[PDB]
Every structure is written in C-alpha cells, then in structure tokens.
Ligand binder design. Sequence first.
Ligand code: CLA
Ligand code: KC2
Ligand code: KC2
Ligand code: KC2
Ligand code: KC2
Lengths: 166, 172, 172, 172, 172
Amino acid sequence: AFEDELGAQPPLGFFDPLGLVADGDQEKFDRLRYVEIKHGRISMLAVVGYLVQEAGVRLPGTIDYSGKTFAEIPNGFAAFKEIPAGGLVQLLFFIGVLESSVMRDLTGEAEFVGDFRNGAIDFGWDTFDEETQFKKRAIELNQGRAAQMGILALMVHEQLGVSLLP
Amino acid sequence: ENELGAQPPLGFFDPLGLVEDGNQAKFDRLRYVELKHGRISMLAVVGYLIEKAGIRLPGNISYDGTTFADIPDGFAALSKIPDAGLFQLFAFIGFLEVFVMKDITGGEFVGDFRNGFIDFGWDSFDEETKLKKRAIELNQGRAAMMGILALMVHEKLIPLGYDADLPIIGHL
Amino acid sequence: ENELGAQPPLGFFDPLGLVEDGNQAKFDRLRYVELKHGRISMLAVVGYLIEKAGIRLPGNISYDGTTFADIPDGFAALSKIPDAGLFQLFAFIGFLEVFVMKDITGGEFVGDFRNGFIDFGWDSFDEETKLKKRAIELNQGRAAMMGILALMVHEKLIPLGYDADLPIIGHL
Amino acid sequence: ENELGAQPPLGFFDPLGLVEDGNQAKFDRLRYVELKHGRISMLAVVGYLIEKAGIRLPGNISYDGTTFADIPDGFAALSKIPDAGLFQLFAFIGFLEVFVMKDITGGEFVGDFRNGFIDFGWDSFDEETKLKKRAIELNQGRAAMMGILALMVHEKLIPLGYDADLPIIGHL
Amino acid sequence: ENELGAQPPLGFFDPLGLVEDGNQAKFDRLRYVELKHGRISMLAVVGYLIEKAGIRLPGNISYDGTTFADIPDGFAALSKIPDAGLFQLFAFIGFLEVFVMKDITGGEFVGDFRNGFIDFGWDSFDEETKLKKRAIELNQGRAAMMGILALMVHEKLIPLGYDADLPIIGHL
Ligand code: CLA
Ligand code: KC2
Ligand code: KC2
Ligand code: KC2
Ligand code: KC2
C-alpha cells in the first residue's frame, strides 16, 4: 500500500514492523507522516540547540530586568530552574501561537502534509524538479528521524549522568 | 445535527476513526455521551471555582457540627460529605437524572423542552438556535472536560487550587 | 380549554371519577379553582420558606411595640397580626381580588393581561407560552398545594418547622 | 393612537365637557400633555418615596459642606439646592427637554424611539404593546398626578411626610 | 450599510472632505474602523469611571505584593502592570482579537453573531435593530472617543482625575 511512499528507502525499504499503516488508510497515514515530520523538525532544532548551549554559547546580557543573565543559565533540564517564571509562560505560549495561528495548513493549498508555506513564504520550491523535490523531502524526513533518536539520547544521558559529549 | 460540532478550526475531527463506520446510532450514542459529559463538566468547574473562592454557606450540614466551612475545598469534599447526604444525592439527582425532569433514553436528540422563553428560535434564527449555540455548548463542555482531568491531576500533588495558588505553580 | 394541565407521567388523571361527565363546563370551573389554589399555595410556601429562614424586616410593626422579629414563625404568625392590620389586608386584597387588576369574575380564563415582558408570549415559540408554561404553573401549584397540607400538619403535631428541624424529623 | 388610557370601569369619561368637541385636534394635544405630566409625576412620587426611606448618598454635595443627609426630606429639598446646581439642572434637563433625546416640541406621539426591556415594539403581541401597556403608564400617571396634589397638601401642614406619619394621620 | 451612524441634527456630515469620493469601498473600511474605536473607547471610559470610583478587588495582584489598591488611578495604572501580566493581556486579547472569536480581519460588518439580551437579531421590528440601535452604539463610541482625548489631556498636566476634581476644574 504505502511501500512506495516517502521515507521508504534503502537499506530497510518499507518498514512497519507493527503493521500500523498495514490497513492502507490514507488519512491515518497522512496523520502519522505529519506527526513524523513535526517531531523531526523539532528534534533537528533541539540537537543543534543542545550542542551550542553545551559549548557555552549564550545570548548576550540579561534575560529579565532583575539582572538574571543568560550566562548563569545552564544547559539541559536544569535551564528551566533558572529561567524566570514569566519567561517560561511565554516560551510555552508563543510556541502555542505557532501551533494555533502559524505552523499549520491555514489555506488548504498545501501540496502535502507539513507544507506550511500558505502562499506566504516560498524560497523557490518549484525551481526544483520533481526528483529534487522528492529528495529534499526525503532528507528533511531522515534528518528528522535521525535527530529524534539524537535528542532522545541527549535527554536520557543527561539524566543517566553518562555524557555522550567530549 | 450531523453538521454540528464540526465548525472551525478542526472541522469534523475523527482522528482515530471510531465514527469511521456509518451508523447514526453510534454517532447518536457518542454525541449525547459527549453532551452529558459536557453539561456535567461545565457545572463542575463552576462548582470548582465557586467552592475554591471561599463562597460557602454558614451553618452545619448535619447534626455533626460539620459546617460547610468545615468541609474543605477539593476532593476531600465529596468524600467527606456524610453518607446519608450522598444517599440523598443519589435519590434526588438519581430521580432527576433518569426520571424527573431530564429524560435519558439512548441520547434521544435530547431536547428536554425547556431552555428559556423567547430564545430557542427556530422560525427566527436558523443558525443562532442550532449550529452556533448548540455548537458552543458542546465545546464549552470540551473545555471543561479537559478542565477536570486538569482539576484532578493538578490536585494529585499536594496544593489544590486555592492552596495551589499560594505556593508553587510550576510542574514536577 | 382542555389539552393542558397534566401531562407525563400521568396525562389526563381523573382516577376517582369526579369530572368524567364529558362536559367541559364543570371541568372549566374546577380548572380555575386549581389555578387559584395554584397561585395562592405557591406564594404561601415561598412565604413559608422566607419566613422560616429568619428573613425579617427591621423595626416595629406598629405602636403595639411588636417588632417583625416578635411575630413567631409558622401558623401563629398570621393569627397574631393585630386586628386592624388584618382589616387592611382585607380592604386591599379584597379590592384586588373581586374587582380590580386580577378580576376573578366567575372563573373565566383568568388571563389578567400580565403576560411577562418579552418572554413567554405569542408570536414566538408555540410550544412554550402555552401547552408547557401554562402547564407548569399549574403543576407548580400542584406541588405547593401539597406543600402546605404537609406544612400545616407538620406544624400541627410538633412546633414550627425550624423547631421541627432542630429536633426529630421522623414520624409519630 | 386614539383609544388611549381610560378603560373599565369608566371608558371614555369626560364628565364636564371641554373635550367633547367632535374634533380630536385639541384632544390630540391634551393627550400628550397627560403623558408628560404622567411621566413627571410617576418619577416624582417614587423619588418622594426613596428620599423618605432614608436612602441617601454618602459625602458632601459641594464645597458648602452640605451632605446628602443635610438636605431635608420633603418640599424644602429642591428649594435649598444651591443655585449653581439648579442652573446645571436647567442646562442638562433643558437640553434634554425642549431639544432632544426626548424631543417634545409639537407635542403628540413623540414615541422617543425607546422601549422598556426593549420589549414591546411590534411583531409580538399586537394587543399588549398597543392599547394596554400604553394604557397603564398613562393611568399610572393618573395615580401619581393625584399622588402629588396630595403630597404637597400633606406637606403643607407644617412637617414633611415621615413627620406626618410618626404623628397624626387623621384630618384637620 | 450606507445609511448608518449620523443622524439629526447632522445627517451625513463630512465637512472637510476625505470621504466624498463617490465610492463606498473606502467609506466601508473607515466605518468598521469607527466601530472598533467605538467599542474600545466605550469600555475604556467606563473602565476609567469604575477604576476611579474606588471599586477595586481585594488581595495582592501577584508575588510582587502589589494589591489592587496599590496600582494608582489614571494613566500610570496600565504602564506599571508587571510585564508578565501585560503579555497575558497580549496572549489572551491577541488570541481573542485577530481571528478567533471576534474575528475582525478584512474589517467590515463582521457582526460577530452575538445579541444583547438575546434581543434583536431580526423577526421583531425591522426599524430599530437596524438604523437605530446599530446607530446609537457607533454614536455611543463617538461620545467615548472624545471622552479619552479629553481624559488623557485631563491627566496630562494635572494628576489623575480624582485629583483633578478635588482641586481646580478650570482651564490653565
Ligand atoms: C527545540 C529547540 C529549542 C528550544 C526548546 C530552546 C530553548 C531554550 N534556549 Mg535555545 N537554541 C536553539 C533551539 C532551542 N532552544 C537553537 C537551534 C539554537 C542555535 C541558534 C539555540 C541557541 C540558544 C542560545 C545561544 C541561548 C538559548 C537559550 C535557551 C533557553 C532560554 C530561551 C531563549 O532565550 O532561547 C533563545 C533561542 C534561540 C537563540 C534560538 C531558537 C531558535 C528557534 C528554534 C527557531 C525555531 C522557530 C522559528 C520561529 C521558525 C520560523 C521559520 C518560518 C518563519 C519560516 C531555552 C531553554 C539561552 C540559554 O540560557 O541557554 C541555556 C541562550 O542564551 N538558545
Ligand atoms: C440533591 C439536593 C438535596 C435535595 C433535593 C434534598 C431534599 C431533602 C428533603 C425533602 C424533599 C428532605 C426532607 C431532606 C431532609 C434532609 N436532608 Mg436533604 N436534600 C438534598 C441533599 C442533601 C445532602 C447532601 C444532605 C442532606 C442532609 C439532610 C438532612 C439531615 C440529616 C441529619 O443531620 O440528621 C435532612 C433531614 C444532610 C444529611 O443527610 O446529614 C446526614 C446532608 O449531607 N440533603 N432533604
Ligand atoms: C395589605 C397591605 C397593606 C396596605 C396596602 C397598607 C396601606 C397603609 C396606608 C395606605 C397607604 C397607611 C397610611 C398605612 C398605615 C399603617 N399601617 Mg398599613 N398597609 C398595609 C398592611 C398592614 C398591616 C398588615 C398592618 C399595618 C399597620 C399600620 C399602622 C399602625 C397602626 C398602629 O400602630 O396603631 C399604620 C399607621 C399595622 C396595624 O394596623 O397595627 C394595629 C399592621 O399590622 N398595615 N397602611
Ligand atoms: C443635571 C444633573 C447634573 C449634571 C449633568 C452635572 C454635570 C457636572 C459636570 C459635567 C460633567 C461637572 C464637572 C460637575 C461638577 C460639579 N457639580 Mg454637577 N452635574 C449635575 C447636577 C448638579 C447639582 C444638581 C449640583 C452640582 C454641584 C457640582 C459641583 C460643586 C460646586 C461647588 O462646590 O461649588 C461641581 C464641581 C453642586 C453645586 O453646584 O454646588 C454649588 C450642586 O447642587 N451638580 N457637574
Ligand atoms: C488577560 C486576562 C488574563 C488571563 C486570560 C489569564 C490567565 C491566567 C491563567 C490561565 C488560565 C493562569 C494560571 C494565570 C495565573 C497568573 N496570572 Mg493571570 N491571566 C490574566 C491576566 C493577568 C495579569 C493581567 C496578571 C496576571 C498575573 C498572574 C500571576 C502571578 C504571577 C507571579 O506572581 O509571578 C499568575 C500565577 C500577574 C502577573 O503576571 O505578575 C507578574 C499580572 O499582572 N494575569 N493567569
């Protein structure tokens, strides 16, 4: 059914050991693929965010007017202890504006699931031919799938106390 | 009736496909299952906010010297009602549920025939009577159903929601 | 006319056979008797519940030096109003009853031209302003007519109802 | 807009004459005259009732150091309002009066384009909003216009009315 | 849509000339612009009056230890709301504003499908809910938009207006 779809590729080919899309439901598959691209886009930002913070790179200056600086805030789950409470609400809320009002199909003209251009921001997608358009979607999915295991490592290993980084 | 509850942003939203099959009946069933959960959850968060704001009734609830002020807010409240109070809840709310006032058959397209006075208006506004007001009450339930899952799982850690607003509001 | 009054779960309920004539004319009069005992017993139970809650006025009721708190709760209250006060009920209510504002002419579809303001009137919902709301007031009366026969017999055997509730509530 | 006001037990009642002219053009003007004296007397009697009940505002009225309690009850109140306040009554009421929001000039069926709970325009009871509730307010004015001719002569003795009720109520 | 708003004693009043283009498409946009500045200024003036009457809430606002009495009256109140509160304004209002519930964008005769007292969509009179009550609210905005240009300039040199009114009211 979905053996010829995006993300089915060497060396594994079509790969569903649980048989989750074995029923051939397109709408179930369209949901799962959208759910797959979305975590991937997060995890690709999450690992680069984790590595640049662990290298010590901070934003300059203070995070609030009480003098709390970015440099005092560590990397990891211990960042949330020292980010002030008004900051943690907006970090949660503004991303929810991206969930509600920005990052979705608003206009219904998306060519596939996770096409968020909405006729507003396009950098030249149609300048790729159909094989390059399929390739860049295949890279983003697989950079996505790699980073999901990558960030899931870097979060489990912060709690284990066994570092994976030099 | 069918086109209801499917207004924007989500539209018709059967993500897992449990109304993927057909019938009016299991869509009838799950609708009035959803509405009654809606109606009960909405008065339970308004029941929550009016309890937790300190709005009480003076006087004992029984001979015990249990006042309404002595009954604490939260989930100790409904349990520490005296038993003969709860069996008189199940008598009246019971008779009101099944029998008096509020007919419950299979989810009968629950009309209940009351509502107000000049308000129900078919013959006046065919999109205000249903499809907006009948759509919001569903969703106000959909908020409040997500309010009581909230209401429990918050209070499962020590401060409740009057207590939860004097100390910490952050997660575990 | 007919086609009003009782309802689920009874419908037309004349089980002893007092009205089985097949004649509307005897049924007309006993309906408006029931409306009137409807209206009076309803304002007497809510009068009873507001008098029993300790909800009184401040000040003396006259230059007898009787406060509104002096007049006891229950059956004694109307009885030990001063006589000149009971004439003035009669002078005002009796005008209000037999001819002005309420006219009860002869038991006549006492319609009295006090029809709410917007609410619950013609050229709107058909079901509501009559065949339902006209039916509920009567059944509201049917609850309150039985509420006083209770209330009198509750007061007849024990003291007043607030003194019926601090001691025993069980039967004789 | 002709069959206004009087009603059972009177009907058209013009016992002296000066209105049975056969022409309604004079009957026209006096009818809106009756409405306005209606409107003024009704809020003057209830103003007299609420002023006498001890219902006042807190604070001084002005730099004079006259509280709202200092101004006596009854007739003397409007007379010993400070003069600059009476100019601002004149400035605001007269702008509201001879001109607009009310616009009275010409004088019949101004109608003011304003309904109560804005119930009773039209497309409801065509029998309650016209001929009846139009009739009560005028008749309500008929009671209150009599209430003030009384009230002034009640006050004329030499106290106000709360000082007419604690002493003698019988005639001279 | 075109015959709306101004009225006696002005009628259509565009004296300087910006809008007499012959094309209503620009008259269209500025109309709903005047509606929203209408709606916002009307709740800001009554907000200004209720904030100044001493009507506050009990308790601190936050961990700061700022009570609802601590926040001064007038202009400085909105400015010294703690920052994280001003975002939750921006959070909830901005969700409520652009799309979601009030949906303004595009910007003309949105209508919002809300009634006052569920009074007055249509199928009553057709003369007051169009061309009059729709006309007052815009004009009600026309008073309140002028009320704040006042209010800011009343607050600009002088302190807050309760301290404009205990000292001098006259011009500079
Ligand atoms: C999942 C991604 C993610 C998450 C949750 C966080 C979370 C956090 N970062 Mg961070 N960061 C990220 C990715 C992320 N970052 C990336 C990719 C970089 C590299 C540029 C950084 C670089 C970075 C620095 C240098 C610092 C933080 C800091 C922080 C903390 C304070 C908040 C702040 O100032 O953020 C600041 C966030 C950024 C500077 C970059 C975020 C960029 C996001 C991911 C953009 C994605 C959405 C975007 C709107 C997409 C629009 C595209 C569309 C319009 C076409 C907070 C825990 C601060 C701290 O104290 O560290 C401990 C700090 O000083 N971040
Ligand atoms: C669903 C709302 C509701 C309704 C409609 C309703 C109707 C009636 C009616 C007549 C129709 C009577 C006659 C009656 C009588 C009593 N009710 Mg009541 N009642 C309500 C519910 C509750 C609850 C929650 C409690 C309660 C109580 C009492 C006690 C005292 C017992 C005692 O203290 O000895 C008595 C005598 C408390 C209790 O049971 O205490 C152990 C208690 O918690 N009730 N109740
Ligand atoms: C039907 C409701 C009702 C109406 C419509 C009504 C109208 C008026 C009017 C007309 C505007 C006046 C002027 C007036 C004055 C007095 N009323 Mg009132 N009155 C009403 C009801 C009662 C009751 C129920 C009582 C009562 C009393 C008094 C006493 C003091 C007497 C005294 O101290 O000797 C005085 C002066 C008490 C009483 O009569 O005591 C012996 C008493 O029980 N009234 N009353
Ligand atoms: C028709 C109802 C009415 C309206 C529409 C209205 C509008 C305004 C406005 C415009 C918004 C202002 C700014 C304003 C201010 C003052 N009013 Mg007010 N006012 C109303 C009525 C009265 C009466 C009836 C009195 C009165 C007074 C005062 C005094 C203190 C003066 C002083 O202490 O010297 C001041 C400062 C009293 C008075 O004039 O005392 C000599 C007095 O009796 N007003 N008033
Ligand atoms: C637009 C109206 C509005 C909405 C819809 C809304 C929703 C919620 C929810 C969601 C259900 C929660 C859980 C919540 C809780 C808190 N709000 Mg509230 N809130 C509203 C408005 C404001 C303003 C205007 C302020 C404010 C504050 C606080 C503080 C204490 C913080 C602290 O002490 O650190 C806490 C805990 C004040 C503040 O931020 O203080 C720095 C402050 O000015 N809020 N608020």
